[PDB]
Amino acid sequence: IRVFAIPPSFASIFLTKSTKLTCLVTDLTTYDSVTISWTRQNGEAVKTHTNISESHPNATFSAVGEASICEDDWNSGERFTCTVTHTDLPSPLKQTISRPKGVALHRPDVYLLPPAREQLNLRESATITCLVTGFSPADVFVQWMQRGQPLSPEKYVTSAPMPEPQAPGRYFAHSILTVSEEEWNTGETYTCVVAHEALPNRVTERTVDKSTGKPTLYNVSLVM
Amino acid sequence: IRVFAIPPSFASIFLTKSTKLTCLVTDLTTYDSVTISWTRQNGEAVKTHTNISESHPNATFSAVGEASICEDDWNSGERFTCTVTHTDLPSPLKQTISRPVALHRPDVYLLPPAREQLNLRESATITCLVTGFSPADVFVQWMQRGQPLSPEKYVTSAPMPEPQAPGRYFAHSILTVSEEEWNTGETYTCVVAHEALPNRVTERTVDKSTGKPTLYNVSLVMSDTAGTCY
Amino acid sequence: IRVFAIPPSFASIFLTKSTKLTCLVTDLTTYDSVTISWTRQNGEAVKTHTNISESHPNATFSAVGEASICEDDWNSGERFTCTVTHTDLPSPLKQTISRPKGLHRPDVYLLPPAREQLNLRESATITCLVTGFSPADVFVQWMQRGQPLSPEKYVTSAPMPEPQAPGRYFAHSILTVSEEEWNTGETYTCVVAHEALPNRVTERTVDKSTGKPTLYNVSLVMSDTAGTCY
Ligand SMILES: *[C@@H]1O[C@H](CO)[C@@H](O)[C@H](O)[C@H]1NC(C)=O
Ligand SMILES: *[C@@H]1O[C@H](CO)[C@@H](O)[C@H](O)[C@H]1NC(C)=O
Ligand SMILES: *[C@@H]1O[C@H](CO)[C@@H](O)[C@H](O)[C@H]1NC(C)=O
């Protein structure tokens, strides 16, 4: 008799440029032929839903209802409801879900930290992280692109959001990039883009090179 | 009715300098005569539980318990079971917790702040990158010339598993400090204690003198009439 | 008729992480049918020992016995008594050994090698100086990269009180390294252990050029019109 719903975060909408509504109903009795539907605040009908998940091997039934709409409807303020109806249910339960509004809105600050000098001494690998702090809300999406070509999602893992101790309403995140030491010698800019709902373009990247953190080495002056 | 028993994490052992295991009962009604105890592999005298809770906001009753054991009798494979004889359950509830993997020495690296970060002259962040270690639950803290900092100042991160390495983990630890408190000192040695090192505890420190790789310059002067004494 | 006893040194509880008490039985006649064991002031069960020593050819009784205990029992205040009964001396000989019941943090000052040693192009000596710590009997070890070196590579000097401060001590520990291995760019950190630091473990690392950037100011003059000055 447990009902849950995962709201569509900004990190998932930015992937396919389209929001998706999902509902997770677990801790129920294993039975088939379960009707899952979505109802709006005004009762307007929703689009066709399919791709219903099966039951878990541990005697747990899970039903997922997919519904794709535009970002304007989700940002307008309309509230949805994951209605679950079945024979064993004495009454059709309801659960509302929407986008919480009324929080802070600060533009993210990207600080691409250069790799440490001692890391390159081993000549084994090199982990370049992208420090992003001072943003609201949390759960932002970051990735890496190789001269415009995105890399595989497996290489980079987004750190879990966590509130900043020195800030009342800001968060921070990390995104490492494990690459070989010999690779970061002929370019490898590794632009760190950030997805947030405060920037005018919602995307901000930084361009670096091998001689980024190293200051000038020559100061030769000519006197004539 | 579920009973949990959180094993003593390595982070709490080093900080408190004393091991302490907790085994409490949950999902129980508001009944009295609820006693708890500790049973070892063979069964001997244990420490009496103290600091009993009162109640919970969700209309339930619980009783936590702590004991005092040694550190050598934990990594040898010994098990500790907290047997609770509930009044409403004819069968006593027993929870056995113990410890068993590969061991890799952690790698400690300190990342200096970026050049563009100091241009704002608002705050400075120092990250001590720790990667390639096993198992998880590693405690990372910061100090200042031998004086430890308050736990509210520095906050560690979660032990996210390394994607490239199938059996390693990486952690992060930020330290937001003022911009003016960086060019006059504040080494902020990154002290980290792990259970896969010959010396257990290791620490590394960085400062502003780590850079400037012999920034030399040669004055090229020719066909000039200065009339001075070099 | 005197039974010696070796107190648990701080240098022995860190290298092996196992504090064990041992009382040396000497100055007695060599005979069989003897009872050697350990007793505690509390009055609980005490583990026995093994590895009985041989017989001294100079007609001197010798016996060694060690038992494995925990680490918090010695620091709590519990006393351990080693009583040995001999046929010639029926009177028991009680040997109560306990740490004194009553402190400054050590300072690691890694002295860089001089230039005269490198001029001979034979070897290089790196010493680690630690001053201002109490009490004595500390442990100094050397580690390379991520593993310790051989025990014979470095020898730790005996503790000696500071002639200036009556409540401070100092220790010395040198290390032999070739010139080629010194200019490679290694660390050769000095990690010690003390019973007063918040983490009890500290280490300091250096490099070939870690003190100052050592910038240059050389000027190249190729003008034949600018005269010189005496
Ligand atoms: C060389 O650099 C130093 C420090 O950067 C500076 O003081 C000196 O004036 C420079 N030499 C010349 C000829 O400008
Ligand atoms: C080198 O610099 C020092 C101080 O910067 C100065 O005293 C000295 O005269 C300089 N050498 C020459 C040859 O001018
Ligand atoms: C030494 O550095 C000073 C700047 O501090 C500069 O004025 C002088 O010309 C330098 N001496 C040389 C280049 O011989």
Residue numbers in the entry:
A (entry chain G): 345 to 568
B (entry chain R): 345 to 444, 447 to 576
C (entry chain K): 345 to 446, 449 to 576
Lines quoted from the article behind this entry:
Immunoglobulin M (IgM) is the most ancient of the five isotypes of immunoglobulin (Ig) molecules and serves as the first line of defence against pathogens. Natural immunoglobulin M (IgM) assembles into monomers (composed of two heavy and two light chains), pentamers and hexamers. An IgM pentamer is over 900 kDa, consisting of ten heavy (μ) chains, each of which has a C-terminal tailpiece which holds them together, ten light (λ or κ) chains and a joining (J) chain, a 15 kDa polypeptide ﻿with no homology to other proteins, which sterically interrupts the addition of a sixth heavy crystal fragment (Fcμ) unit. Pentameric IgM is secreted into serum, or transported across epithelial cells by the polymeric immunoglobulin receptor (pIgR).
